[PDB]
Symmetry: C4
Subunit: 452 residues, 4 copies
């Protein structure tokens, strides 16, 4: 454990990034309309407060060497976008790359950290996503990558404006080891894609290669989760592993895959940044994003990512030859435990565990193993497709339906035993008894255990 | 994406290198006779404009430390060879090594970059192949290799003469990551050899070891293609992965192996440098080199290397225990798609795919997956063995037979719907239907899909 | 071989560390009560002389930048704890980390080595455990880790007070290669845990990955032993591989697992630091710790770690899929040999070897292979559960029961043929004959061979 | 190819090292008696001219920092040993380590290169074996190891006395890549041992791990040969891979294993340094060492190590689970070819090949594949056990029996068609015909092919 380096990231950040769905075709108008939508839908007040502008926003540099925002896309400048966002109680993110160019070929910040940090401060930016394209040979060992990333960290600090600092170097040179002292989160892999399991030749490292020499992209949800599994021990208050933006409401993932994806990103204390087009967001994907109970896990005070207890390969493999089952378990701040039974097989199956596996670090005869625990389904009381479609078509308000974390923080709601945050009691687990369920294909059983 | 670093390599380079067939036994006369031949055969005007002189050309250094060309082999000097080439509208390549010696033991350029760059400029050289033999311990991490290669890059730039810069360090220290900002292409492996699949003990890294510590040589065509597969995402306008000179018309590859080799080098946007002895070039190998349709893929404006969609091992293995099948697919600038079904098995087989696999990045219900696509065989209208033998024996001209890209660029020919560049329509592919063919052993089915 | 760098560590150190059982909840009173206990139980005079205070002891830094011990936990300061310990003939250990923070987030010593070394000297500290948390990017290659650790080594030396120097960097960057010239021992892995075999996702490197990029923790006893196996050749007088504190009397290991664990740590010349709560130490675990015969192996003058002769996987696997059998053998200073037959299978089994396997480096026809050897059981005459429970409840003294190594060193006791140190003769082994026994599940047969 | 860096090592060196059989128990008298023996036995005049004194020769340093030879072991100093050796036409080798200590703990040369080089020059030393123990963190990347080794290289050069420079860093940090420009040979692995195949836990890298992080020792003959296999392409005139001293006449290898070992070290152009106790050398081992025909392969002018053509695992495995078969083939300077069929299986087997496999780099229809080749057995006319025992007991002279390479160099003897150097013609190999033999367990068929 260590204090946060800058006082931010006390829990993993939440928000939205305009990329996964809009590429270089961004404007003040897109960004603010979408911002309005996220507020209207009650997602802002759930915690999704960072509106992150991604690549392709700039037009080059002025005569003083200073970044210039594209005047066609942003006729009032960035500072003006910031103010609008702040006036609707949003936080504002921007993007650059620790290299000569950004990934899409725009001006990068390598060797221009001071001016560029100053640009972000002058434009009242609250958050920086900091990429790793065209890094000019400045990678290959922990030391050289750390110093390249420390250079922007220090330059942001020098501006005296608080900036949440988000590393995007894909776990290159063992980022989990060095990120915390200079940054609030770090991408620990190549880009995610809307595929639950699919191996891809553009993502050459498999789920077991957490230390990868070619991060790539188009990595599956499970490839990324698998790489992240040993890394939980290097995350914590102030500095989080980042498993990349959520693909919920993007492409063609099933409701089960989307739930597993969301539940798992939450449990390992990843940032929850929406990759969906929230103006073309479908009903089922919306109610996944807005599941307060699950966000409560992510936003646990003094957050500890959960541990993979076990992993087995099954014969029920999918069209891509993939098929495994996993159990994860982790402690929660109020003494509760989160448990996940994850069915990455291609068929529905019975899944099972015991108290000895759940409290994998408790001794025989300890109180945890000797006591009874009520089981709470974290997926109960999810917003039905009807209500969600209503809200999405502006026929019903989100107010009084969605949990309002701005009004009541996750910590305080948890203290007040707030039903919206614990799911639904479905049973109890005694010593020497098994916990059984049937878990859908590419799905999840996701529980919170509380003492009886 | 990033701009070209020097304005060259807007498409992968094409030409000829005198090595694969002539070793140290080079002269002004060999080089110019061969040059004449490449022009006469219509290959120059197809795009094969770089005549690259390789190792063993020098005799040492003069009293000022300056490279001295062998006076027996080049009695008029290199500048004189350059002028002759330029007067027949050719471009001129030379060779050195980023080390103390070249691979064949001639003077290398390490620490002598300024003088040596100046030598190339003074002799009006247009292209440099820059090797990695005897590098004096200056390798082992990305940073140290990058700086060694940047040293020649900067020295070439300082001369003010445009020089296409071709790295030859065999992918050592992850060249795909750092090449583009200092160079126009980079060898991503040990030397190729005229063997389609054959594992070799002098090439210890298998096709899956893209990050290799001992690049070696005598690597098979498939070993090299396999290593190159994840790397396409780091290639693009201005900076290309180099899979080494073509072995078409060299050794004893079959017509099928030669077609697969050529089609695959094209599709991943490798340079197409002829390794053949063009004065002892056989009929079938000639018509492979001169297939305009396939070169059109390589010379696509705003080039994107294709992606390996899938790869499976088969039981139909060859004399060396090798046998796999692959599907590759990639977008083309005008909206078309290139598709390859590659049969590395030892027996002819039926091969098949669908629109969902071809447009592997398109969503269900998108227009691409919802529309019909005409299939064009990129191997149709290939110059028959008769016509090719005629041309080769100086009994028929190439004029009016071969596509003349000097007269009409590949881009413009593609715009004009020029039949010579699209192959032959053979069918159409509808939603929910399969695309089937029979693909020869160690062969390829190579298509261009256009919207109906 | 090399001299000890500082004159210490002539044999592996022994003692106790307050962590495995007490975490941050430490005080002068805990530490001294426990110290009293270790003396009373006769363990001190067996060799367990280092009382090591671990993380969480400090409260920050004073106005001069100097470490400040927590005044609530240590109202008299550390120097006062030291004096008490020294007055009962104990040695005193403290802890820091070669990073910005300690693992539990207290002040670390990186860049503060001189002051911090001086703090330890001023407080009369005899031993330093030096961790690797929050090392600020200063790892990744042997050179950078060596210099970071050399910095504290030199600063300790500069104080002129002898300090036993114990590296805790988990074998990162091949510590076995560079530790000896700057240190007396080095952790060669992630943290141990009270699990004999259990794979854990927080310890991603398996037993075969001695060169690990993510040491982690919760590694099994066998995972750690397996990683240590090639490393014995880089240990010796003055500088020892450290396989982490003993889990004997911690969690729920069986008596067999505890014996194997203890016997194996001894044989490879690891430090024997008690991880147990000695005030809540059970009878069986106590008599394992106090087995003089086995400690005699660890404390062999001119110590050579034993060699793994063979390793095989068995079908008798445990609940975690683990199951292997091993034979280890090593020379002893007086010409004797230590032999271990280790049953990591889940079932009791017959185990067997010969003289040719025991003297794996002796030639055919040599005297060793030609002679007869008496077999001594190193586990005979172990303190029975009754006597141990008596001593533990303060109903019987340890005096005259336990070997007193303060009175008679292990070397001198070995010379005097002292029965307490050789175990019990159980037979003899002749040329061309097999040595057979039945070895319990997760257990060990542990012998000393002496010439007939 | 590159010139020799210092003009030496035009062929691999030959000689004797006093270690494998005498450890630290060395003297002027041992060394000179043994020297006398090597001359008397005719081995000197065969090429075994370097008498290499190994570790444990020094007693520390004098008041000027200068190495001091042990006055008990060398009462006249080293220079006096040198002169004696030179007066019997021998060359003289000494030893140090690129570290703080030598492997046996004597003074090392790290940071003391100038004085120590000067010591070797002052004592008229002709050869240096330069180890890698206690290198103080100065390893881990090619660059850092190269510079450490270059430091002694330059210091030797500065003395102006020719010194054959032999690196002993066990292939650490890819020595094959950088050795040639600073040295005449380089150990490419951990120490050999008298075991043909035996895996050992002190040698964790298997035969496929040529790039090893823990070289270790007690590596088998086949483990070392396997690691060396890709490396032949980086050896050549002036700079050789070193597979460690010969174990012929050491331990208990069979006559077949000894022949295979010797034949294979020769074929890959390793140094041939005798590890045997030549005063306790058995008859069969002697006639292996003195096989002129095989040494002729090693001492080929313009030496090219042979290539492994193929390798297969067999079911006929030994007591250690090992069993493979290999074919090697390489060109010789006079146009001949060396072929080896190696039976690492546990049983005698038929072995076979063709001309297409022998001339693995020749095209179909080339002259090599189209011609007939006489097969010569390189093991014929070996000195029978009787004659060898006679010579060894000083009952018969070696003169007129052994080839005298001092009188007639291997090159010149090869030119003169000297029967002693080509073995015995046993047949001929035609196109489209197979070459068959039966090869003993752990043995070799070792041929020279000459054009008919
Ligand atoms: C995934 O495939 C579904 C069919 O199951 C397909 O409908 C989605 O594309 C979306 O289709 C929507 C149907 O309501 C259409 O209204 C919506 O505009 C469309 N989204 C896009 C980008 O065209 C697929 N999912 C997504 C979001 O791509
Ligand atoms: O309390 C310090 C402790 O550190 C070691 O354990 C390291 C362990 O600490 C946690 O911070 C991380 O989550 C985990 O990844 C690390 O491995 C060390 O082994 C021990 O001696 C002790 O100093
Ligand atoms: O638009 C920037 C984008 O970069 C990341 O994706 C990196 C991706 O970009 C392409 O240039 C390459 O072809 C591919 O190899 C790279 O992996 C990053 O993950 C994302 O957050 C975003 O900044
Ligand atoms: O006597 C020096 C000797 O060193 C080599 O053997 C290295 C060997 O030495 C031991 O100190 C270690 O336990 C073991 O790990 C090392 O591998 C070298 O091969 C040899 O030539 C010789 O100089
Ligand atoms: O003639 C130069 C040549 O070098 C390359 O081939 C490298 C090859 O050369 C030999 O010296 C070695 O034995 C072998 O190990 C090396 O791989 C390069 O691929 C080629 O373009 C050309 O410049
Ligand atoms: C800058 O750094 C110091 C810690 O070094 C910290 O106290 C402060 O909050 C930082 N300021 C900003 C704006 O990040
Ligand atoms: C809501 O919709 C999703 C897909 O859009 C579907 O999978 C799910 O079953 C629906 N929920 C219910 C309870 O029907
Ligand atoms: C040299 O460098 C600059 C870019 O840094 C570029 O504009 C110019 O074209 C280069 N000149 C040559 C001849 O490569
Ligand atoms: C042309 O020749 C090649 C080999 O030289 C042969 O494989 C091929 O079948 C020939 N083409 C046709 C259509 O016969
Ligand atoms: C400090 O270093 C020297 C060796 O360099 C050693 O003789 C001395 O004992 C050391 N002192 C202490 C207290 O460690
Ligand atoms: C002593 O106790 C341990 C467990 O506490 C038990 O396994 C062992 O069998 C006992 N010893 C004897 C000889 O009964
Ligand atoms: C020293 O170096 C030069 C080459 O740099 C070489 O010509 C000379 O022979 C060397 N001298 C010795 C004695 O090694
Ligand atoms: C010579 O002796 C060796 C072993 O010392 C034996 O293996 C070999 O067969 C003998 N040679 C002959 C031809 O008998
Ligand atoms: Na406005
Ligand atoms: Na001319
Ligand atoms: Na006191
Ligand atoms: Na004398």
């Amino acid at each position: 454990v260590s204090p946060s380096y800058n006082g931010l990231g006390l829990t993993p950040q939440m928000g939205w990034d305009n990329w996964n769905t809009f590429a270089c075709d961004v404007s003040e108008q897109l960004l603010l309309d979408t911002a309005d939508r996220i507020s209207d839908l009650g997602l802002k007040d759930m915690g999704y407060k960072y509106i992150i502008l991604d690549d392709c926003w700039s037009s080059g540099r002025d005569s003083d060497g200073f970044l210039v925002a594209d005047e066609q896309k942003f006729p009032n400048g960035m500072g003006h976008v910031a103010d609008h966002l702040h006036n609707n109680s949003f936080l504002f993110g921007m993007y650059s790359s620790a290299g000569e160019y950004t990934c899409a070929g725009y001006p990068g910040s390598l060797g221009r950290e001071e001016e560029d940090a100053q640009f972000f401060a002058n434009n009242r930016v609250d958050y920086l996503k900091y990429d790793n394209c065209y890094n000019k040979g400045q990678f290959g060992t922990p030391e050289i990558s750390y110093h390249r990333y420390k250079a922007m960290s220090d330059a942001l600090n020098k501006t005296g404006r608080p900036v949440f600092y988000s590393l995007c170097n894909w776990g290159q040179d063992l980022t989990f080891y060095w990120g915390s002292g200079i940054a609030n989160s770090w991408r620990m892999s190549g880009d995610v894609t809307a595929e639950f399991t699919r191996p891809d030749s553009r993502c050459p490292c498999d789920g077991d290669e957490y230390d990868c020499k070619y991060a790539g992209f188009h990595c599956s949800i499970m490839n990324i989760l698998n790489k992240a599994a040993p890394m939980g021990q290097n995350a914590g208050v102030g500095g989080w592993n980042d498993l990349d933006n959520l693909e919920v409401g993007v492409g063609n993932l099933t409701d089960d895959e989307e739930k597993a994806h969301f539940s798992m990103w939450a449990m390992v204390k990843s940032p929850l940044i929406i990759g969906a087009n929230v103006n073309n967001l479908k009903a089922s994907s919306y109610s996944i994003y807005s599941q307060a109970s699950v966000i409560a896990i992510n936003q646990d005070s003094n957050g500890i990512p959960a541990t993979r207890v076990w992993r087995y390969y099954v014969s029920d493999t999918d069209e891509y030859g993939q098929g495994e089952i996993q159990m994860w378990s982790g402690p929660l701040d109020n003494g509760d435990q989160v448990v996940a039974l994850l069915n990455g097989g291609s068929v529905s199956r019975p899944m099972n565990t015991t108290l000895e596996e759940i409290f994998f670090d408790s001794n025989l005869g300890s109180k945890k193993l000797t006591s009874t625990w009520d089981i709470y389904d974290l997926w109960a009381n999810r917003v039905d497709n009807s209500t969600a479609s209503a809200i999405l078509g502006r026929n019903k308000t989100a107010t009084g339906i969605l949990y309002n974390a701005t009004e009541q923080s996750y910590k305080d709601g948890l203290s007040k035993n707030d039903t919206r945050l614990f799911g639904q009691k479905i049973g109890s687990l005694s010593p020497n008894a098994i916990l059984n369920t049937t878990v859908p294909a590419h799905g999840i059983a996701f529980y919170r255990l509380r003492p009886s």
